[PDB]
Design a protein around this ligand. Structure first.
Ligand SMILES: *[C@@H]1O[C@H](CO)[C@@H](O)[C@H](O)[C@H]1NC(C)=O
Length: 246
């Protein structure tokens, strides 16, 4: 399991959490020195538990699929909550079984559906450590519209930061003041599966992507990533989605 406490949190302690998160995800191989997530994992070992505590010390446990860093559901006191999607229903066979009741949220976990439920795109939702405290607090008691927004914050501040050093740094910058994600952050989130795939295809292609990935950079400028020498690959991406899952 990994844990993070908002009470007393700072950029260093959040960095320790994101490092713990990455280090809890199993891998057998690195591809261009980046851990390659597993094609599949059977049974309960598929799911990592993240214990998150709000500033007041209240807690939720979040279940994360270790093959793809997708959040499946969460436990809040004696109630479990899972996305309305088959992977989460399967997760519910293994985690949080001792919950007194199980609620299926009225959306799947992909960004498009969550944004629909929340009423707003994530361009417009501030993220940060204070936003993560709020999210944890929201998820403690069911409210499906509020929860959609909370879940967009939680996904970005945990899973997306684990995937991309740039996103981790963005959240660190927002340790004490929330701000909407940069356009680069959104671009990276949206590109993770594409990037993961092209980095793996590059292994037999002399480091060259079969298909270039278009990203927005730190200045709002739109670049084409064509090979493994790009800083996105050498510095930024921290985890690859196995091409067996793409
Ligand atoms: C590969 O990417 C580098 C660094 O981003 C770029 O300067 C270069 O022109 C590209 N080279 C090839 C062979 O695609």
């Amino acid at each position: 399991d990994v844990s993070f406490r908002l009470s007393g949190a700072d950029p260093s302690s959040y960095g320790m959490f994101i490092k713990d998160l990455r280090n809890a995800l199993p891998h057998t191989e690195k591809v261009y020195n980046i851990p390659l997530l597993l094609p599949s994992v059977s049974g309960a070992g598929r799911y990592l538990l993240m214990h998150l505590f709000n500033y007041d010390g209240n807690t939720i446990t979040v279940a994360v699929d270790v093959t793809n860093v997708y959040i499946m559901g969460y436990l809040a006191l004696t109630t479990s909550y899972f996305f309305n999607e088959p992977a989460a229903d399967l997760a519910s066979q293994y985690v949080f079984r001792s919950a007194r009741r199980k609620i299926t949220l009225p959306y799947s976990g992909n960004y498009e559906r969550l944004q629909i439920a929340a009423g707003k795109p994530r361009e417009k939702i501030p993220i940060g450590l204070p936003a993560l405290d709020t999210a944890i607090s929201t998820l403690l008691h069911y409210d499906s519209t509020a929860a959609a927004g909370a879940l967009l914050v939680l996904i970005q501040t945990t899973a997306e930061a684990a995937r991309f050093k740039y996103i981790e740094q963005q959240i660190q910058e927002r340790a004490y003041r929330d701000e909407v994600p940069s356009s680069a952050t959104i671009s990276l989130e949206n590109s993770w599966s594409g990037l993961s795939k092209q980095i793996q295809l590059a292994q037999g292609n002399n480091g060259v992507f079969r298909t270039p990935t278009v990203l927005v950079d730190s200045k709002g400028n739109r670049v084409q990533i064509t090979n493994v020498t790009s800083n996105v690959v050498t510095s930024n991406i921290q985890l690859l989605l196995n091409t067996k899952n793409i």
